[PDB]
C-alpha cells in the first residue's frame with residue numbers, strides 16, 4: 001500500500017483542528033485548541049485506488065522551530081493553509097514556503113495553496129490576491145471551506161495527483 005506523507009501547517013487562529021477532524025471523522029468543531037502532535041491517518045480512494053494517507057498536524061507557533069526540520073525531512077506534501085480573515089497568514093505563507101524550500105533544497109516542489117475561514121464576512125484577503133500570487137509560485141490556489149464542506153475533498157485529490165504523476 002502507498003503512504004502519502006502529508007503535513008498540516010499554518011498560523012494561529014485558522015483552526016487546523018477542524019480541518020483535520022473534518023477529513024477524518026467528518027466533524028466540524030468550533031472549539032479552538034492548540035494541538036502539538038496527533039496521529040491522523042485514514043484510507044481514502046484516490047482515482048479508483050485505495051491509499052493510506054499519513055498526515056501529521058503540527059504547531060504553527062514560532063516557539064517550535066527545532067522540530068521543524070524534523071517533520072520537514074519526512075513529509076513530502078506540505079499543506080500550507082492560511083486564512084482570508086488574517087492578512088498576516090497570507091504573508092507568512094511566503095516565509096513558511098521559504099523555510100520549506102530551504103529544507104527541500106529544490107526549486108520544483110508539488111505543493112498547493114489553500115485557505116480556510118472562507119465563511120467569514122471579514123474577508124481581508126481577496127481572491128485576486130491569491131490567484132495572482134499563485135502565478136509567481138507556479139502552483140494553483142484552491143478555496144477550502146471546511147465550514148460547509150466545499151472544496152475540502154476536491155483540493156485534497158489534486159495534491160495526490162500532482163505527487164503521483166511526479167513519482168511516475
Ligand SMILES: c1coc(CNc2nc3ccccc3[nH]2)c1
Pocket residue numbers: 005006007039054055056071074075076
Ligand atoms: C504515529 C506517529 O506518527 C505516525 C505517522 N507517521 C508519519 N510520518 C509522517 C511524516 C510526514 C507527514 C506525516 C507523517 N506521519 C504515527
